[PDB]
């Protein structure tokens, strides 16, 4: 003797997070910059230190 309402099926998928990789250990590796210009600063002059 009850009135059963129609069930509401969920249509929403889940969101992602800010970590574009899986772990926080893998993702900390892929955040440090690469390129030829960062090496150029420490090799500024060998004679200038000499």
């Amino acid at each position: 003797k009850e009135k059963i309402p129609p069930p509401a099926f969920d249509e929403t998928f889940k969101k992602f997070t800010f970590i574009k990789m899986g772990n926080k250990l893998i993702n900390n590796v892929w955040k440090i910059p690469t390129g030829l210009d960062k090496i150029e600063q420490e090799v500024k002059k060998p004679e200038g230190v000499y």
């Binding site: 009850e2 009135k3 059963i4 309402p5 129609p6 069930p7």
Partner: protein, 80 residues
């Protein structure tokens, strides 16, 4: 033939023939005398001639819930 014979009978629900394809019409149904006979016949499974005829009786009952002959929660609530 079993449905065409039983659609013209005086045991077919004429005014309360409500169907099992809605989500609010699984309670409101028809013919609660045949909801007493099948719920009594599916709740017995303790013999050795009753076991060789339970599959064919369950198929015949499953056609009757489709055409709206009986309710769903009248048979679902009253089986073992």
């Amino acid at each position: 033939f079993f449905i065409a014979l039983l659609r013209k009978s005086d045991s077919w629900p004429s005014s309360h023939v409500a169907n099992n394809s809605n989500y609010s019409s699984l309670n409101e149904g028809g013919n609660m005398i045949a909801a007493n006979i099948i719920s009594f016949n599916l709740s017995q499974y303790n013999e050795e001639v009753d076991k060789e005829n339970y599959e064919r009786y369950m198929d015949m009952c499953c056609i009757l819930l489709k055409n709206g002959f009986v309710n769903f929660y009248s048979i679902w609530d009253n089986v073992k």
